[PDB]
Structures are given as C-alpha cells and as structure tokens.
Design a protein around this ligand. Sequence first.
Ligand SMILES: [Ca+2]
Length: 72
Amino acid sequence: ADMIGVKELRDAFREFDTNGDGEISTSELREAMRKLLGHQVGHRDIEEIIRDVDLNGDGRVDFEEFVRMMSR
Ligand SMILES: [Ca+2]
C-alpha cells in the first residue's frame, strides 16, 4: 500500500540489521557507524545518538526512529 519513498530507507535498515530483528541496537548501530566511519574512538556518542533520537521507550532505533534520523 505504499510506493517508492520510505522503502529505500528499508534498504538501509536492512543492511543495518546484519542478523534479522528489524531493530538497530547500540551493538548493531556501532557496527553500522563502523562500516561508514571506522577507526577513531568515542562510543558514548553512539549511544547518545540512539538516546536523543526518540526511543518511544525501547532506548533503541527502529524503522520508525530510523526514518526520522535519516531525513534532514
Ligand atoms: Ca525509538
């Protein structure tokens, strides 16, 4: 019931979850940011990003919190 638009986001969201839970957790996040950034330190910043995103109460990013974090 939806054409191109938010699906692309799913593409990323897919590569995000290396396993299969449709949920990017600090562990999965770091792995994600690592593939793009890599090297360097600062882990608190990672969780900080997942903490200020929105977390309706799961302290984690989901296709929803992920869609709002990607947009500008
Ligand atoms: Ca959330």
